[PDB]
């Protein structure tokens, strides 16, 4: 039983490995093998990992992608195509057009996806021709990449993960002094575009209590919003519903990527000597993506049967929506399989966003598969946060020049 970690140099690696250590008591893990296109970055991180692991499983490095995944049962995608400079372009370029610049939402997520697709195509292909492992994905944009792998590359064992579902659950658990698994949600939407309609803790409906609580805590939704919409809304929906406010915010402060560059450079210096995971990591980004990955793999391994909110085909989870939409929804996870659960109908409000962005998602895939500039423009125009006709051509040209090393559109 071996796990491959693709993008070993991620500054999140230590947390991932803590997670794998935590579960290595209920499931057998023989070796974890790491791969990164930045040999030197990974050396520092994996050296730190070795100190944390203390021979509880074997820590290995592979020179090639194929070498890492060849004998793997689980493959974790955790790499960032184009790196932080790519993120910086994603956040920075749309700004001049009066458009939201953000890592995974809107035009920023469009360029991130175009950067990712070629790499994931290559990677998924190699996995498929060798180990046929289950791929657990964090690489952003996670949901959009899942849609691409599930519905176009047609690789079934590809599960998109994100940090927000688990962050929400832990929040509720603390509020109600309960374990993570005591929390059961009606949850649906796309990655970073999701909605909670019902909250259950130890079987009790506590939705009303959660709403009343959310009102006692300018950049967040007003009370009337929750009264009217009656959904708990993913924080990323601020970019859609509070665009003017979010634009003024992003455009008048340092770009986020530049701040994470400084955080990562500080964490790396810490990693050269650190004997225990530093604080600096723990309270940032999505530090708890680690727990999600490790818990998912745990439950894929045992025959216990547990609920995980995961990115996968609808398959009747929301009867309101096509079976083949990849959604972020709670699933029954057991012995290598992921089963969707009945949830009933989705709210019209939520569906307006879900449908809009899903069409944009597939338009973008179509453009990439045909390598078409014309279809990319069509995709760009279809996003709710995309350019007006007067800006689209110039915007796309800026994107493609910035990403010339990663994607070529004719």
């Amino acid at each position: 039983m071996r796990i491959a970690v693709i993008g070993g140099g991620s500054s999140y690696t230590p947390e991932l490995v803590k997670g794998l250590l935590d579960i290595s008591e209920d499931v057998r893990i023989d070796e974890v093998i790491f791969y990164d296109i930045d040999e030197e970055k990974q050396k520092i991180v994996v050296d730190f990992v070795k100190r944390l692991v203390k021979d509880r499983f074997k820590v290995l490095i592979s020179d090639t992608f194929e070498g890492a995944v060849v004998d793997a049962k689980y493959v974790i995608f955790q790499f960032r195509p184009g790196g932080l400079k790519g993120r910086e372009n994603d956040e920075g370029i749309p700004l001049k057009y009066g458009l939201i610049g953000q890592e995974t939402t809107g035009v920023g997520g469009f360029s991130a996806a175009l950067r990712a697709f070629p790499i994931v195509e290559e990677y998924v292909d190699t996995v498929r021709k060798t180990s046929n492992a289950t791929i657990v994905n964090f690489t952003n944009p996670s949901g959009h990449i899942t849609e691409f792998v599930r519905n176009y590359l047609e690789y079934e064992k590809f599960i998109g993960l994100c940090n927000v579902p688990i962050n929400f659950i832990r929040e509720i658990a603390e509020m109600f002094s309960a374990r993570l698994e005591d929390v059961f949600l009606k949850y649906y939407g796309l990655n970073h575009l999701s909605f909670i309609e019902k909250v259950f803790v130890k079987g009790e409906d506590v939705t009303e209590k959660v709403f009343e609580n959310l009102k006692l805590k300018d950049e967040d939704f007003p009370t009337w919003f929750y009264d009217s919409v009656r959904l708990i809304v993913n924080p990323y929906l601020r970019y859609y519903l509070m665009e003017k406010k979010m634009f003024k915010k992003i455009s008048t402060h340092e770009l986020r990527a530049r701040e994470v560059m400084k955080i990562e450079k500080e964490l790396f210096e810490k990693y050269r000597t650190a004997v225990e995971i530093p604080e600096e990591l723990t309270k940032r980004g999505g530090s708890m993506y680690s727990t999600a990955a490790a818990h998912l793999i745990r439950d894929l391994e045992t025959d216990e049967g547990k609920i995980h909110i995961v990115n996968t085909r609808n398959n009747g989870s929301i009867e309101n929506l096509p079976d083949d939409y990849v959604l972020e929804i709670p699933c029954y996870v057991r012995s290598g399989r992921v089963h969707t659960l009945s949830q009933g109908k989705g709210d019209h409000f939520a569906l307006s966003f879900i449908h809009a962005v899903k069409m944009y998602e597939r338009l973008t895939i179509e453009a990439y598969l045909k390598r078409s500039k014309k279809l990319a423009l069509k995709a760009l125009l279809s996003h709710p946060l995309g350019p007006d006709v007067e800006d689209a051509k110039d915007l796309l040209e800026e994107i493609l020049e910035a990403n010339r090393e990663y994607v070529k559109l004719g």
Copy 2:
């Protein structure tokens, strides 16, 4: 055989009647009865109508709505709830928030729908308890109202009409020196939110020739047609060219104010006329539809109705604007295949907005109205929603009350 016309004082009435006279040779019409809440406006128009009709059928006025529809086989809704003052509010109010102000699109159509729903509920109810007539609808927003009647009031014989499909068809017809019926389209979308994917003239695929000719006409650039590959309803300019349209609307006289002046001019002309003044084609659509509902010939009309498999990509119950086979009182939808992903993003988004709006009205809920307003692609940001709805509801005090 009797036709009722609800909103007889519409400045469009003379054209409708011209249309009714043109078809009265292929189909029997005994009487046309008119109803309006403005008796004096209607007297002027109907006096003019009588001079055009010249006893070819009976022209009657009813003092009540029920009196008009009671023995009617067809009922035409052509009234404007809240009148032009209402339209002016619709266009004017959203402007202060940096939002598109327009008669049928965005926030403006939201308030127009809230004004319409109570009236059409009452009217549809009365028709249902009396004549069970086919209602042909022009009242805006036509598609949204159709969604409401077909899927919530559950009255099957309600057909939404609009002037764009016929305007396009005639355009193509004269480009190609062919009759109206020689033009066959792949056409789908919502009312004022519609797309043309394929154009056929006398059986020939002329799509490419249509695109090339569109390039030789505040309109879409050449590359847009190359990339999207759909002929797009001009109202999509409000979505796709919002900045440009906002700049235009907000630096010119509101359109409703212009219409007020045109209509005042037409009404002075109507007191004196013996023939229709040069100073609109919705008429032909209504009369031709009624003609074809009457005969057993079987003819294609683009109307607003339930999808039912016209676009396989879309739920059966979405009310769409689509080509149907019309024959002996019945409207059948036609196979068209799949709709484009780009088209569907608009269709899904505002269809959700449409139903959220209806739900808010049915429960008479301010909270639900905010929800609906937030859901429109051209709606307010959260910071402006509450103020904008309070302004809409004050302005529309007399027409709708939300709790």
Copy 3:
């Protein structure tokens, strides 16, 4: 926390109660209240129950249906409309026409259903107007009744149960030395009309091993090689009609046998200190898991809702569900086999035609329903058959 048991006089009651005793350690049960139209039958059984219970919860009798369900969280339907004399007619009458006579399959199930509908309509209405309890149903035909309540009476909390899914799991469990929950199935169909496509034990795919072990009046080897489905034994009546008809028609009717068995058990229950020599476990385990927040899999009858993507969402099917805190969620299974679907579709249409006939109280529509069943009459026999069914069921159903 109170459970109501409708049809307390059922000879099965003892086992049900043993079941509720077993789970009364993981979940709190204050009282079990019984009701039966046969007061004397029930008194003997419930006196037996009191001896087994030994005051671990309160055992009560209600004079009225309303009195039983008024304060109940769970209501178990386990009555037999028309009794065994009704089942005797069900089994006996179709035989005359060369038709399969069977308690729940074919024309037999049709009359059983028409007998049930009026009663379940009344009972569901009273539950809905009082406690709004979850109804767990054994009353035959279980699945058809569930289709009726879920899609026509529109009462959501009505869960059809059957003893075949649990019988199968138990068999697999002991074949592989595993606990019941170690077994996971791809399972779908209608009640008494179900198929297993895949078998998992402790996560391992053992479908192949199950097929090989099944080959060691039942289907031949080649059948399993061809169809590649483990098939409910009731499918024998569709697939081996000639053989089944020959069997049913040359032996004592089954209901007659059961009458003798029940008369025997009843004399035993008068003095019996212990249960004399499996639906019970299903009911209790389901109630257990509805009560806790653990989350467990049960095969039950419910709306498809995407369990089988190949089938309409509203078909009531017998399928595995995730059960937890008063809620039943269906699980993804993928596509159903064309072979299975041909039976599922045909009898589902039959089921709704029958319900439509009942709701309109129409003889004409009943004929239509009768003709539509794969095991139903030919046109030449339909009218006589129906008139014989309605005659025998005079006291239970009137069709106009």
Copy 4:
């Protein structure tokens, strides 16, 4: 503009040609080209054809299938795989098992289908790599073949035809003194498994009057009062199986009667100046008008209704989009559009679903060349064998069809 006719030697050919001559005034036809595996049979028929046509268009014979379809805009499948001896096997073999033996219904249609698929696969493939013509199909079992081509070979321009829709329409037309196009139906089901729910003549709903008229070997009055559908007469095999079995099994096999009808028609063809009365009155001789009218209306931009075998696409909302059904379509300029009809009756659906599953099971058996899957398909048919008879029945069918189909 060229029409290819595959199976030129069919004794129906003269009628088909009459049909093409009737429409050759509203649409242009330059040449009709014929192909048959029996050159001798065809020569006699086409010689007769030439005397009817009178140089109105050119009548040509092709030695090869490819040669016929290469330049065609329309290709008519009109052949009978295995011929009349094949039909005879289909009708005869099931009989010994107490099963309905019929040309297109039940076990008989199963073996007919397995005989057909290899040939239509080859033919569709060749059409697809050359002319891309619209194929109009009569070859039985028509609906099942259409399911196969539409959903498995994935050739879109393949339209299944049958003679019952037009026979019904014509009946109604005469009853009401109206033209064929004055008759509009709510019509759906499978080929030879179809139901009429509503009847309109000149826009009037005359369903009630049609039911009243139908009551003046056939369904009794109460049946129509109960089921309230006008049912295709082949449904007698399902609904009156005992009666139909007793009938078929105690009379000369139907195939043997048509052998003698055909032999008589061929003798007539040698010197006939005009179409004989025995051809007008037999088989499903009105299939001709259906073919010709369909092609006419695919050619013009008029827009006309034709009941045809095609994908559901929302015609019956109660049924999946991809079921091939026999349903009314809007036909115009090369395209076939499906019409809204609403919901299908539960009674009708039970037949439609059951046989549709059997149809796809049979196709899957053929495509995998699997004896095992064939047994599965056989067992799924409402009119199929019991488990005790299945194995023996299939081995008899495969033996008889050795030259047409091989299943491992």
